């Protein structure tokens, strides 16, 4: 979905059209999200992250 065009037809995120993907996708976000929650708890911005 994220690699989908945002123009006519291919509509990107808004083209989601069935609950499996909705539910499925949220499963991924929940994990991917908490994963980053721990990662930041356990870290500091790198170098560029700081010089940027």
């Amino acid at each position: 979905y994220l690699l989908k065009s945002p123009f006519g037809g291919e509509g990107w995120i808004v083209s989601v059209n069935n609950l499996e993907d909705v539910v499925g996708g949220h499963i991924w976000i929940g994990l991917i999200c908490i994963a980053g929650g721990i990662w930041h708890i356990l870290t500091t911005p790198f170098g560029w992250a700081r010089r940027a």
């Binding site: 065009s5 123009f7 006519g8 037809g9």
Partner: protein, 335 residues
């Protein structure tokens, strides 16, 4: 070489360039040259465009019978809607010029660059140590091009409904808009004209007050302008005499004496008003139109007593009923 890339970044970002090609500029300069170059060629030699997707080409270029006032670059086909139509999406250019391909190449590059143009209006201010926000004033006119060239089309379902790139083509966008949205009767447009009228008004106020209260340093037969040297220390006009006059025209507390508060107002007014006008077009892009007072006031029996609001509806129906002659096949105009 202190390091090529290290150098490159020093040039790009250099504040010693006649024209500040910035980081945003690296995106701006090319997109804007494409938009401009494609436009000029289109406007001069492009052939007729089937704007309404009904195989009824509208020629809008000089070489095909148009003059500066009528001529324009016509919007992509309605057959195309919101689909992306890059040249590499056509069997040929002949096909691309017929479905209004140039339009997209132009609006997209322009809107892209005009944004970076904003990003730049920030960058240079940074490299020069001046406060930001100028770029925020430019967010209003930009937010309009956006509303008129992209939001409205997204909202309406087709780029063919975006404002054409030409004088008369624009009047078309307006006249029809009014018919389908009754914009004159919408709060946001009104705020828009207040800002524009007001702006021009204030622009004249300031302009005159100041120019009229300039300290004499010039001859009777010498341009009053010379009385100013680029890089002066003190002011060139008596802002206390200015306020003295203006305070008496209306009344003291209704007059500015703080040049900073004056200039903030001077910028705040138009920018805020145009912001609303842009939000109007971006809002009526989802069919939340102006007030509809048709047949509101009715008499004791039920008869309809007209108001100017009704005389306005007739003029609107004329537009509705005549625009896009051959494009409709059904009762309701839902597109």
């Amino acid at each position: 070489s202190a390091n090529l890339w290290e150098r490159f970044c020093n040039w790009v970002t250099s504040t010693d360039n006649r024209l500040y090609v910035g980081w945003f500029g690296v995106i701006m300069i090319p997109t804007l040259l494409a938009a401009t170059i494609c436009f000029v060629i289109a406007f001069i030699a492009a052939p007729p465009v089937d704007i309404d997707g009904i195989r009824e080409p509208v020629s809008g270029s000089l070489l095909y019978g148009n003059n500066i006032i009528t001529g324009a670059v016509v919007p992509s086909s309605n057959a195309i809607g919101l689909h992306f139509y890059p040249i590499w999406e056509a069997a040929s250019l002949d096909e691309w010029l017929y479905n209004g391909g140039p339009y997209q190449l132009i609006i997209f590059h322009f809107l892209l660059g005009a944004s970076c143009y904003m990003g730049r209006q920030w960058e240079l201010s940074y490299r020069l140590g001046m406060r930001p926000w100028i770029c925020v004033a430019y967010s209003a006119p930009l937010a309009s091009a956006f509303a008129v060239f992209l939001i409205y089309p997204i909202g309406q379902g087709s780029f063919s409904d975006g404002m054409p790139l030409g004088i008369s083509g624009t009047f078309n966008f307006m006249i029809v808009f009014q018919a389908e949205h009754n914009i004159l009767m919408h709060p946001f447009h009104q705020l828009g004209v207040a800002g524009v009228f007001g702006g021009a008004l204030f622009c004249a106020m300031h302009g005159s007050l100041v120019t009229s209260s300039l300290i004499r340093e010039t001859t009777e037969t010498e341009s009053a302008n010379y009385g100013y040297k680029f890089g002066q220390e003190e002011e060139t006009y008596n802002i206390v005499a200015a306020h003295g006059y203006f305070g008496r025209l209306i009344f003291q507390y209704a007059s500015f004496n703080n040049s900073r508060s004056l200039h903030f107002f001077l910028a705040a007014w138009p920018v805020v008003g145009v912001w609303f006008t842009a939000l109007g077009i971006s809002t009526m892009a989802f069919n939340l139109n102006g007030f509809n007072f048709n047949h509101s006031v009715i008499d004791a029996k039920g008869n309809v007593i007209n108001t100017w609001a009704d005389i306005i509806n007739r003029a609107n129906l004329g537009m509705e009923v005549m625009h896009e002659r051959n494009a409709h096949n059904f009762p309701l105009d839902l597109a």
